[PDB]
From a paper:
To understand the molecular basis of their association, we purified the Glc7-Ref2348–406 complex, but this was refractory to crystallization. Therefore, we made a chimeric protein where the Ref2 fragment is fused to the flexible C-terminal tail of Glc7. We also included two repeats of the RNA Pol II CTD in the chimeric protein with the aim of understanding how the substrate is bound. We crystallized the chimeric protein and determined its structure at 1.85 Å resolution. The structure shows that Ref2 wraps around the back of Glc7, burying a surface area of ∼4,200 Å2. The absence of density for the RNA Pol II CTD in the active site could indicate weak binding affinity, crystal packing constraints, or a requirement for CTD modifications such as phosphorylation or proline isomerization. First, an N-terminal low-complexity region (348–370) of Ref2 buries a surface area of ∼2,000 Å2 through polar and hydrophobic contacts with Glc7 (left). The other two Ref2-Glc7 interactions in the crystal structure are more generally conserved among PP1 regulatory subunits. This includes the non-canonical RVxF motif (SIKF in Ref2), where Ile372 and Phe374 insert into a hydrophobic pocket on Glc7. Finally, the ΦΦ motif that is found in many PP1 regulatory subunits is formed of a pair of hydrophobic residues in Ref2, Val383, and Tyr384 (right). Tyr384 stabilizes the formation of an intermolecular β sheet via a π-π stacking interaction with Tyr77 of Glc7.
Numbering used by the authors:
A (entry chain A): 4 to 298
B (entry chain B): 348 to 406
């Protein structure tokens, strides 16, 4: 009846070395505890996180749990390194539950040294469709999927590292004038179809446009290098870190080096040959990349 | 199987006094900007450049 986060982590980590696929079988009430305890930490922490280095920043995982375990293996297990993840933990991959449960377990254990932001797949209307709901029903029940939804509805939306790096899953918003706009978003909340919170989780850069244009996704917008340049100038910042689009090297610069896309799922879905990346920011704000080959 | 977690110190600064220090970010020089890892590669990682990386990924 008393839940043991250390024990859960131990069990989630026992499959290091095992063939990519071995399930970990937490109990239902263990997963319920991770959801409700991590949800309360999210609510108690700001929606716009202000973080200081050293930290390692990671993009999309999409249920590729054995690639998450590799990231930790090379990047260092918490709390040997500090981490910021940029969203899209679940869907498409085969082990969404292990992936999100390890992340929540580390949030509970190291709440002010391990951070996960909301991606557009941490949203019931998306992850009902793209695989997470199926995995939750197959292994547990519908009720457990709703418990994750209540947890995801409280995730933070963006972070700022040492006042200089602005990080979010998707990108900018034509409605983003002041950071105070983000702080005023109330939780729990779903992601709306339009507006600031939508854009932060859905928008994409487009190297060839000027200003704001349509997004082929059918949601939010695309924005050109001029938008990134002006944002950073106006907001006195130096780098946007975002995820949300697969990139062949796992990282990819934009607008000279004013924006970087990070994507952390190698061989994404099996139909791309991309690597995955993690950006490391050290104590003195020196940045480099750790890259994972597809295994 | 065990971490050194008796001295974890928070990096959450929202409440806290503006760090008296300030600095601009910098990327490492291109020849040291990237470390690549993998089954084929050594555990501690190979330190490559952007163009060197694309060769290793896509020979
Ligand atoms: Mn994604
Ligand atoms: Mn996404």
């Amino acid at each position: 009846q008393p839940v043991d986060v250390d024990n859960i982590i131990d069990r989630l980590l026992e499959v290091r070395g095992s063939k990519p696929g071995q399930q970990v079988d937490l109990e239902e009430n263990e997963i319920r505890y991770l959801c409700s305890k991590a949800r309360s930490i999210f609510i108690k922490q700001p929606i716009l996180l202000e973080l200081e280095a050293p930290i390692k920043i990671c993009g999309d995982i999409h249920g590729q749990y054995y690639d998450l375990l590799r990231l930790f293996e090379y990047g260092g297990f918490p709390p040997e390194s500090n981490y910021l993840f940029l969203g899209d933990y679940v869907d498409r991959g085969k082990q969404s539950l292990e992936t999100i449960c390890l992340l929540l377990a580390y949030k509970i254990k190291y709440p002010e040294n391990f951070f996960i932001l909301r991606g557009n797949h941490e949203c019931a209307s998306i992850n009902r469709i793209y695989g997470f709901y199926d995995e939750c029903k197959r292994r547990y029940n519908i009720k457990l999927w709703k418990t994750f939804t209540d947890c995801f509805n409280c995730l933070p939306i963006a972070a700022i590292i040492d006042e200089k790096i602005f990080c979010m899953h998707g990108g900018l918003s034509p409605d983003l004038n002041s950071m105070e706009q983000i702080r005023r978003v109330m939780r729990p909340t779903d992601i709306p179809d339009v507006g600031l919170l939508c854009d932060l989780l859905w928008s994409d850069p487009d190297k060839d446009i000027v200003g704001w244009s349509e997004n082929d996704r059918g949601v939010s917008f695309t924005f050109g290098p001029d938008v990134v340049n002006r944002f950073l100038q106006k907001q006195d910042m130096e780098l946007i870190c975002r995820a949300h689009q697969v990139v062949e090297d796992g990282y990819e610069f934009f607008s000279k080096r004013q924006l970087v896309t990070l994507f952390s799922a190698p061989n994404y879905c099996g139909e791309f040959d991309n690597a995955g990346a993690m950006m490391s920011v050290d104590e003195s704000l020196l940045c480099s990349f750790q890259i994972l080959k597809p295994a | 199987i065990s971490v050194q977690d008796s001295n974890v110190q928070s990096i959450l600064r929202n409440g806290k006094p503006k760090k008296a220090r300030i600095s601009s970010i910098k990327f490492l020089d291109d020849s040291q900007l990237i470390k690549v890892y993998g089954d084929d590669l050594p555990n501690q990682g190979l330190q490559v450049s952007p163009t060197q990386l694309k060769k290793i990924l896509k020979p």
